Design a protein around this ligand. Sequence first.
Ligand SMILES: C[C@@H](Cc1ccccc1)Nc1ncnc2c1ncn2[C@@H]1O[C@H]2COP(=O)(O)O[C@@H]2[C@H]1O
Ligand SMILES: C[C@H](Cc1ccccc1)Nc1ncnc2c1ncn2[C@@H]1O[C@H]2COP(=O)(O)O[C@@H]2[C@H]1O
Ligand SMILES: [Cl-]
Lengths: 215, 202
Amino acid sequence: HMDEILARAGIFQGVEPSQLQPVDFPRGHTVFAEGEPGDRLYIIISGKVKIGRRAPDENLLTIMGPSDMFGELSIFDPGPRTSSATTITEVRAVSMDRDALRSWIADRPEISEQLLRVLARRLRRTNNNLADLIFTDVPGRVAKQLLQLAQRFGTQEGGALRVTHDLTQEEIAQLVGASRETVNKALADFAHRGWIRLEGKSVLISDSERLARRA
Amino acid sequence: SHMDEILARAGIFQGVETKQLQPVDFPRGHTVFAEGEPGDRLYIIISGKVKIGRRAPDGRENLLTIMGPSDMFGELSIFDPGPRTSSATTITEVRAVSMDRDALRSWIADRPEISEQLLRVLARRLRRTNNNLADLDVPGRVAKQLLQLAQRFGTLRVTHDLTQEEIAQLVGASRETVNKALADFAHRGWIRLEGKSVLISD
Ligand SMILES: C[C@@H](Cc1ccccc1)Nc1ncnc2c1ncn2[C@@H]1O[C@H]2COP(=O)(O)O[C@@H]2[C@H]1O
Ligand SMILES: C[C@H](Cc1ccccc1)Nc1ncnc2c1ncn2[C@@H]1O[C@H]2COP(=O)(O)O[C@@H]2[C@H]1O
Ligand SMILES: [Cl-]
């Protein structure tokens, strides 16, 4: 489990199995808050972490899962955390500070490149998500967010995909950037069309082809 | 050692423990590359300006930024192999240096500290974007743009070498609203639009 998942984290890709001790967090734990000094990045081994940024008075930007890396901004560009990280399931994680990062990094520049590729990918994606917030209708952003979650945690379930996302309705709405009421009706409508099925903290996507067209 | 001056204040080089490569000339009005095509080159401007544009759904162009001397563009398709996320278009004659992935790899074997600066540069670009949720007016956004243009190329004669449509594309508002704001500002005595430049009052 751990070895299989960790190998896919960019900071470990290609690296053979080379005591930075893995930490455990309860569900609903704030790993760190927006604005705090930060000396540490984390790699998720298991569980989900939501990344949130407070509004003038909290909109979710993304859901981090197994293999993903969060909190690297303040290590790469020293500054306060640009958002909060909050576990939504129990999380088992491995973390490292600037010192260890640099140690691990001096070893290999290709790891440096993998890390760059993560930030570029986030930057590429940043444009698109931001353009959606300017240009895309609500129901369309819902379909879109569902598929974004589908590609990250989706698995094959008898010729369809099960996307177990672990989010409340409220957290889904905070991810889309719209009201819970509006987000629900869109979800509801997708359901009556039979493109998706809502089952607790998981959606069953029967027709991703359609949901894609709608996105 | 003029090229040496400009390059020295590029993000990639914050650190001085020379480094000339071999540059390229681009005419004004040149598409260095277009949104969507494959990239394998990043550029560091020595002289001239470049607009970075992305396609809006209504077929208009959102200009994301105006790069000038010392700035880098095109690095995203080196680090994350894929299509250009924007187009880059010279608005003046441009001198710049280029590297493809092989070149960048070799640089980084040469000066390993270049890896840290690149990580810092992109991380900083993420951090800034986060801080700028102001998309959530038009004369108030234009003034901001004018000021942002003032810091980068001001001397406060601001030779921005931009077009009015280009200015509105920078703003993300209609040429209408924008041309309006930029008449109300002139009238009131603040700025005075003279060509592809401008002069402020406050
Ligand atoms: C951060 C946003 C712009 C913005 C402006 C105001 C508020 C939120 C976001 N996007 C970019 N900003 C500055 N330079 C960029 C942006 N997206 C791509 N670039 C550069 O031009 C790209 C074209 O080819 P590439 O290989 O994809 O990478 C290039 C980037 O250097
Ligand atoms: C522009 C984009 C935010 C966004 C804007 C519009 C729609 C959807 C998302 N930025 C981010 N994208 C992916 N991961 C991020 C983003 N901002 C912060 N993180 C991660 O959480 C941060 C917490 O502290 P840190 O600043 O040390 O670095 C962490 C990043 O890993
Ligand atoms: Cl990612």
